[PDB]
Specification:
The structure is cut from a larger assembly and holds chains A and B.
Chain A: H1 4-11, E1 18-22, E2 39-40, E3 50-52, E4 57-61, E5 66-73, E6 76-87, E7 90-94, E8 98-100
Antiparallel strand pairs in A: 1-2, 1-5, 3-8, 4-7, 5-6
Chain B: E1 2-3
């Protein structure tokens, strides 16, 4: 039952520098199934135990590929499933991605 | 939590057009011109 101060101190040490998309679920194995190359992402300062990316991210999905999930790297620190899978070639737009302790 | 969202892909461009121009003109110092009637002449006073 951490207080807001503990959550803010904790989140200040997360430094996810890049993101990668996966067609297979990367939670079991985040090293394989790379769909797109690493793309830099930027994160804001913690507030009320939450952080979010400061700006939009654009990713080039290769030909005849599909995207299902994502994984953060800096080593890997997090993974998650996209709001909806999409069979495109094109540009996939990722809005703010938030990490929370609430 | 870890959450993701989606946004609309936006692109910008600069399209502009141009045409160019040219001019021409041809002539020469005239002599006699052209006349349908052309015959020997005598001019009295």
């Amino acid at each position: 039952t951490l207080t807001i101060d503990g959550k803010n101190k904790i989140l200040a040490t997360l430094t996810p520098t890049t993101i990668i998309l996966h067609n297979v679920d990367p939670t079991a194995d985040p090293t394989a199934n790379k769909v797109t190359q690493p793309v830099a992402i930027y994160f804001s300062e913690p507030d009320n135990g939450l952080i979010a990316s400061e700006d939009t991210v654009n990713i080039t999905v290769p030909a005849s590929a599909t995207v299902s999930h994502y994984s953060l790297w800096d080593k890997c620190v997090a993974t998650g499933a996209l709001s909806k899978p999409q069979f495109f070639e094109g540009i996939y737009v990722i809005s703010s991605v938030s990490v929370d302790l609430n | 939590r870890v959450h993701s969202y989606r946004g609309v892909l936006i692109i910008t461009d600069k399209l502009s057009v141009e045409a160019g121009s040219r001019a021409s003109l041809s002539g020469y110092i005239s002599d006699g011109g052209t006349s349908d009637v052309f015959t020997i002449c005598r001019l009295l006073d």
